[PDB]
Amino acid sequence: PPLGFAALEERTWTVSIGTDGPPVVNARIVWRLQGEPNLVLVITGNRIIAWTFAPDWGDSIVERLSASTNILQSESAVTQRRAMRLAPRREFDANMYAVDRERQLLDMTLFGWGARIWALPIWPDI
Amino acid sequence: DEDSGLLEITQEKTGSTSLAPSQLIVKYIDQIDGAQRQIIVNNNAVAASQGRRSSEEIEFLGVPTGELAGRVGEREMRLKTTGLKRYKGVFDRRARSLNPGQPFLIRSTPRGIPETVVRVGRIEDNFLGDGKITLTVVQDQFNLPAT
Amino acid sequence: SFNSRESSLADGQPVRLYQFSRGAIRWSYNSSDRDITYQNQIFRTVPGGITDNGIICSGDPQSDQFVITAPADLDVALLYKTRSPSDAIDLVVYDMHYGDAEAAVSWVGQIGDVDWPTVDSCRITCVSEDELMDQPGLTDTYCRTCTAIVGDHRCKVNLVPYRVTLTPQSVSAWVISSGVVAGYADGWFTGGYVEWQVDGDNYDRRFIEQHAGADLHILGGTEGIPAGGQLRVYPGCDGLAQTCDDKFSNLPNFRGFNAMQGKSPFDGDQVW
Amino acid sequence: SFNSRESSLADGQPVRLYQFSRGAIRWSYNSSDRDITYQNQIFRTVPGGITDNGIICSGDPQSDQFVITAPADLDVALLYKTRSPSDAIDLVVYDMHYGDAEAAVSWVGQIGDVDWPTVDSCRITCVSEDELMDQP
Amino acid sequence: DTDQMAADMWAGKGGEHFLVWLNKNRQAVKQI
Amino acid sequence: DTDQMAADMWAGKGGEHFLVWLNKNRQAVKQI
Amino acid sequence: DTDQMAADMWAGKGGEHFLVWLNKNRQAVKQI
Amino acid sequence: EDLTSSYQRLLSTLDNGSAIPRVTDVAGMALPVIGHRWIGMGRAERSAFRSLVYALRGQQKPL
């Protein structure tokens, strides 16, 4: 960090962002110098791991669209509808295989990352 | 109405009339002298119905004059011996703006209940989730006579 | 269109908005999956949803509570985690349908209680203004002391001249020490309170068990007191007529009865 | 070792012992399937098991009762079948782990009530000394 | 499902357990 | 099984039956 | 069926829901 | 018979409200689950398996 800046010199560092870290990026890097108020460079974001396994499709892949709509009807056959979810929740069901170097990677991937946000590719949209 | 915002009406509480007092005693204090005084509100018809006499005592120490006590006692007898019908209806969002004590009309032809004036009681509503708005109402029989 | 949408049998898109306000600071939350802009106010979307149990109006404050459910990391509720904020957090609930710019007010009240039943959920019990009528209303006694809070609307004493602004010298677990107050007689600040700015125009206040020399005993511990933040300290009135007059010269407004009568009836047994 | 076994994550072998005493006569029962010898006292095994509902200490005698369940042929409870014995049957409860000679006292009290809800079971309500403070 | 087994259970079975629960918790239920 | 149907049933269904049971047995419940 | 799940449910699960139901309805239960 | 392995986690408290759900890792650890099958083919192996079962005492004794 200690770095002398020549006059009329711009020093552009290479901020390399790795792929390993907490799922929530809450960083506050402080550039503190004498005779100058602290100039903190705040880096914010999230870390995610993408699902990179191609699932076998001999059995059809099932996509489920679900929404909530609680409806109450009176004694007469009249219904009032109160659709709750504007964006239906999407669920995907599929089967897959892993033999040569994908089985161990899958085991480690579901071991370390476990239950956390993925980046699921849309297989039907290949 | 069933087609105008009423979902289901369960309770009716038709009540009974053979019970209930036939004589009402009202006790009040006169502010001129501060001495205990009382008046009697009588129910001749229900008394004839009653084979055994009955009476209750109600204290209205806030009343400073006998005539006012008599008026309020007539109102109380009116309420207690007119046979109120208490309904527990279920309503949709159409009953969202109602407030306690607000009177409104209800009609349900299948139940054989004609247009009736009722006053809102306990209120329980669920805007998010079940969507159930349930109200407890009573028949409108409240009135304070001026004589 | 809000009422028309409510009566509509096919356009029902309920969405409940919550607004927590404390003076100049407002917190906005919504129960939908995307932010809603209403009256130039944007309501944040909590990742996990915020939902209530319903509104009951039966005339009984003990029974007509309002319950809010939210995750563990809710910002407004996080203040209560260590110590309840001094001021009450007013809450206003709006109802609106997506795609419409009109909303209707449903519930108004203040935070009554909050707890974190699970590490992933919260339950906030909101109380209405009606519950504040259960306490007694006598508020009258024929005793010798003042029977009035220093500075209340009955004492009519202005504490602004007595305001003291200082930076504490040292802060301990239970005692806050400053040398400036050392120049006052012992017990001068006894009964007073310390007010300091937390955020915006809202101040959190604590009490003083006893003032002795340079050391101040704070009621409930000094937790939450900034070590360098500016603190405002006011004195306290013992309530005695001598104390009321010599220090504040408020004897004309003295509400106490020192020597009018302690026992004397006019229907006793023997006057002598 | 009793405390060490309690803190142990793999040696937990709970066993509850009951001791009913009335002057010079003592009745010993255990909740296990075999007799336990402790302090030169052997606790009989009831064919069907003896179990309780738990210990509550909330400061209220009416609510902090102790309930014991045993079959119909229990000897100590059989005395109450015709007439309650004049003297109170003091009850002391010990806790120990199989294979250890050390036990800890958990509950102390006397018989408060007994009933035979079923021809194959019993329910004994034991009361603590604190309930004796409700009378004038 | 929640009609005959949730409410009619009070007939003769769910009473004793409720009573023992009541005698278990008294100070926490007796008021409000 | 005994989670959503055993406890959440109190929401709006198991209240009336409990109330009628209470008005049925009073002397046996009112004390202890 | 109505033996282990209808009554033993009071053990530790059906208490909180009953308590919230009680704090919901007070005037209608407090007497009779 | 083909066997299975699963990573059971204390992943409760999904807190599914109305907008979207959110899951919080209470411990952030995975405990694998493994199935096992065997064939005796003799008295000694069966006796050893019975001794192992008795030593396990259910879930108490780990290995």
**CA-to-CA dists, residue G20 to C57, C64, C66, E32, F10, angstroms:** 16, 12, 12, 10, 9
**Closest listed residue to residue F5, CA positions, set G2, C248, C230:** G2
List Cβ neighbours of A3 (8 Å cut-off, separation of 6 or more): A11
Distance of CA D90 to the CA centre of its chain: 10
Using CB atoms, which chains have 3+ pairs under 8 A with C? A, B, G, H
Cα distance between residue A84 and residue H16, in whole Å:
14
What SS3 class is residue B6? strand
Token readout for C30 is 């919504």
The pairing of beta strand C25-30 with beta strand C41-45:
parallel
DSSP secondary structure code for residue G7 in this structure: T
Cα distance between residue C214 and residue C212, in whole Å:
6
- CB contact (8 A) between residue C60 and residue G24: no
Report which secondary-structure segment, H or E, holds G17: helix G14-24
Report which secondary-structure segment, H or E, holds H63: none
Q: Are C36 and C18 in contact (CB under 8 A)?
A: no
What SS3 class is residue A63? strand
All residues of chain B having their beta carbon less than 8 Å from the beta carbon of residue A82 are 131
Report which secondary-structure segment, H or E, holds B134: strand B133-139
Q: Burial-class residue B39 by CB neighbours within 10 Å (0-12, 13-18, 19+).
A: middle
What SS3 class is residue A41? strand
Q: In this complex, which of E2, E15, E23 lies closest to F5 when CB atoms are compared?
A: E2
Q: Are D55 and D127 in contact (CB under 8 A)?
A: no
Cα distance between residue F10 and residue F7, in whole Å:
6
Cα distance between residue B65 and residue B31, in whole Å:
8
**Closest listed residue to residue B86, CA positions, set B133, B125, B121, B124:** B121
For chains A and B, count residue pairs whose Cβ atoms are closer than 8 Å.
28
Cα distance between residue C2 and residue C122, in whole Å:
30
Q: Are C174 and C217 in contact (CB under 8 A)?
A: yes
Q: In this complex, which of H13, H17, H26 lies closest to C51 when CB atoms are compared?
A: H17
Cα distance between residue B22 and residue B47, in whole Å:
5
Cα distance between residue C139 and residue B132, in whole Å:
44
Token readout for F6 is 């055993």
Q: Would you call C67 an interface residue with chain H, using a CB distance cutoff of 8 Å?
A: no
Q: In chain C, which among 14-33 make CB contacts under 8 A with chain H? A: 31-33
All residues of chain G having their beta carbon less than 8 Å from the beta carbon of residue E4 are none
Residue F28's φ and ψ, nearest 5 degrees, are: -80, -15
A60: left (phi over 0), alpha (psi -120 to 50) or beta: beta
- CB contact (8 A) between residue G13 and residue F1: no
- Partners of H31 in the β-ladder: H8
From D19's Cα to the closest Cα of chain H, the distance in A is 29
- CB contact (8 A) between residue C98 and residue A83: no
Report which secondary-structure segment, H or E, holds D2: helix D2-7
Q: Are D23 and D88 in contact (CB under 8 A)?
A: no
Cα distance between residue A100 and residue A111, in whole Å:
18
Cα distance between residue A123 and residue A126, in whole Å:
5
Q: Would you call B13 an interface residue with chain C, using a CB distance cutoff of 8 Å?
A: no
Find the radius of gyration of the CA atoms of chain D: 16
- Cβ count near H20 (within 10 Å): 17
Report which secondary-structure segment, H or E, holds D5: helix D2-7
Q: Burial-class residue D35 by CB neighbours within 10 Å (0-12, 13-18, 19+).
A: exposed
Interface of D with E (CB under 8 A): 56, 58, 60, 62-63, 65
Cα distance between residue C264 and residue C271, in whole Å:
9
- Cβ count near B59 (within 10 Å): 13
Q: Which amino acid is at C142?
A: Y
From H22's Cα to the closest Cα of chain C, the distance in A is 5
**Closest listed residue to residue B61, CA positions, set B94, B86, B28, B92:** B28
Token readout for C209 is 């068990």
Q: Are D17 and D29 in contact (CB under 8 A)?
A: yes
- Cβ count near B87 (within 10 Å): 21
DSSP secondary structure code for residue A61 in this structure: P
Dihedral of alpha carbons B127, B128, B134, B135, sign: negative
All residues of chain H having their beta carbon less than 8 Å from the beta carbon of residue D12 are 60
Token readout for C59 is 């005339």
Q: Are H28 and H10 in contact (CB under 8 A)?
A: no
The 10 Å CB-count burial string (b at 16+, else e) for C146-156 is bbbebbeeebe
- CB contact (8 A) between residue A74 and residue B92: yes
Closest chain C residue by Cα to residue B136: C58
Q: Are F10 and G29 in contact (CB under 8 A)?
A: no
Q: Would you call A114 an interface residue with chain H, using a CB distance cutoff of 8 Å?
A: yes
Closest chain H residue by Cα to residue C117: H13
Q: What is the largest CA-CA distance in chain E?
A: 34
Q: Which amino acid is at F1?
A: D
**CA-to-CA dists, residue C228 to B41, C170, C214, D41, D87, angstroms:** 75, 9, 17, 68, 71
Cα distance between residue D81 and residue D115, in whole Å:
8
Report which secondary-structure segment, H or E, holds A39: strand A36-46
Token readout for C221 is 């511990």
DSSP secondary structure code for residue D81 in this structure: G
Q: Do chains A and E touch (3 or more CB pairs under 8 A)?
A: no
List Cβ neighbours of E24 (8 Å cut-off, separation of 6 or more): D56, D63
- CB contact (8 A) between residue G13 and residue F3: yes
Token readout for C189 is 């600040």
Residue H59 has, within 13 A of its CA and on its CB side, a CA count of: 1
- CB contact (8 A) between residue C120 and residue H17: no
List Cβ neighbours of C167 (8 Å cut-off, separation of 6 or more): C178, C228, C229, C230, C231
- Cβ count near D36 (within 10 Å): 20
Q: Are G9 and C46 in contact (CB under 8 A)?
A: no
Say what the alpha-carbon torsion angle C26, C27, C32, C37 is, to the nearest 10 degrees: 30
Residue G28 has, within 13 A of its CA and on its CB side, a CA count of: 16
Q: Burial-class residue C217 by CB neighbours within 10 Å (0-12, 13-18, 19+).
A: middle
DSSP secondary structure code for residue D127 in this structure: E
Cα distance between residue C187 and residue C131, in whole Å:
37
Using CB atoms, which chains have 3+ pairs under 8 A with A? B, C, H
Q: List strands edge to edge, sheet with B23-30.
A: B35-42, B23-30, B56-59
Q: Are D106 and D91 in contact (CB under 8 A)?
A: no
Say what the alpha-carbon torsion angle B108, B110, B111, B112 is, to the nearest 10 degrees: 90
Q: Determination method here?
A: cryo-EM
DSSP secondary structure code for residue B52 in this structure: S
Cα distance between residue C200 and residue H4, in whole Å:
59
Cα distance between residue H63 and residue H52, in whole Å:
11
Token readout for D42 is 């052997």
Report which secondary-structure segment, H or E, holds F27: helix F27-30
- CB contact (8 A) between residue F32 and residue E22: yes
Q: Which amino acid is at D91?
A: L
Token readout for C267 is 């229907």
Report which secondary-structure segment, H or E, holds B27: strand B23-30
Q: In this complex, which of B2, B128, B132 lies closest to A72 when CB atoms are compared?
A: B132
Helix, strand, coil percentages in chain F from 3-state DSSP, rounded to 5:
60, 0, 40
Q: Burial-class residue G22 by CB neighbours within 10 Å (0-12, 13-18, 19+).
A: middle
Q: Which amino acid is at A61?
A: I
List Cβ neighbours of H61 (8 Å cut-off, separation of 6 or more): D10, H55
Cα distance between residue D78 and residue D99, in whole Å:
32
Cα distance between residue D33 and residue D47, in whole Å:
8
**CA-to-CA dists, residue D53 to B100, E24, F26, F27, angstroms:** 48, 11, 26, 26
Report which secondary-structure segment, H or E, holds D132: none
Q: Are C11 and C5 in contact (CB under 8 A)?
A: yes
Cα distance between residue C98 and residue C13, in whole Å:
6
Q: Which amino acid is at G13?
A: K
Residue A112's φ and ψ, nearest 5 degrees, are: -75, -55
The pairing of beta strand D103-118 with beta strand D90-97:
antiparallel
Interface of G with C (CB under 8 A): 23-27
Distance of CA H22 to the CA centre of its chain: 26
All residues of chain B having their beta carbon less than 8 Å from the beta carbon of residue C13 are none
Distance of CA H20 to the CA centre of its chain: 31
**CA-to-CA dists, residue C3 to C9, C20, C32, C254, D30, angstroms:** 12, 25, 20, 57, 71
What SS3 class is residue H47? helix
Top residue of H56, H60, H63 to mutate, by most chain D CBs within 10 Å, is H60
- Partners of D45 in the β-ladder: D30
Find the radius of gyration of the CA atoms of chain B: 20
The pairing of beta strand D14-22 with beta strand D25-30:
antiparallel
DSSP per position, C90-142: EEEEEEEETT-S-EEEEEEEEEEEEEEEETTEEEEEEE-GGGGGSS-------
Cα distance between residue A23 and residue A117, in whole Å:
9
- Cβ count near C259 (within 10 Å): 7
Q: Which amino acid is at B114?
A: P
List Cβ neighbours of C242 (8 Å cut-off, separation of 6 or more): none
Interface of F with E (CB under 8 A): 5-6, 9, 13-14, 16-18, 21, 25, 28-29, 32
The angle at the Cα of B23, spanning B21 to B24, to the nearest 5 degrees, equals 95
- CB contact (8 A) between residue C12 and residue A80: yes
Q: Burial-class residue C59 by CB neighbours within 10 Å (0-12, 13-18, 19+).
A: middle
List Cβ neighbours of A90 (8 Å cut-off, separation of 6 or more): A63, A64, A65, A66
- CB contact (8 A) between residue D62 and residue E27: no
Residue corresponding to tokens 């530790």: G12
Q: Do chains C and B touch (3 or more CB pairs under 8 A)?
A: yes
Distance of CA C73 to the CA centre of its chain: 23
Q: Are D19 and D76 in contact (CB under 8 A)?
A: no
Q: Burial-class residue D54 by CB neighbours within 10 Å (0-12, 13-18, 19+).
A: exposed
Residue D77 has, within 13 A of its CA and on its CB side, a CA count of: 24
Q: Are D129 and D109 in contact (CB under 8 A)?
A: yes
Cα distance between residue E19 and residue E12, in whole Å:
12
DSSP per position, chain C: -HHHHHH-SS---EEEEEEEEETTEEEEEESSSS-EEETTEEEEEPTT--EE--EEESS-TTT--EEEEE-TT-HHHHGGGTS--SS--EEEEEEEETT-S-EEEEEEEEEEEEEEEETTEEEEEEE-GGGGGSS--------SS--S-TTSTTT----TTT-EEE--SEE-SSEEE-SGGGGSPTTSSTT-EEEEEEETTEEEEEEEEEEETTEEEETT-STT--SSS-EEE-------HHHIIIII--GGG----SSS-SS--SSSS---
The 10 Å CB-count burial string (b at 16+, else e) for C166-182 is eebeebeeebbebeebe
Q: Which amino acid is at C207?
A: F
**Closest listed residue to residue C216, CA positions, set C230, C237, C238, C235:** C235
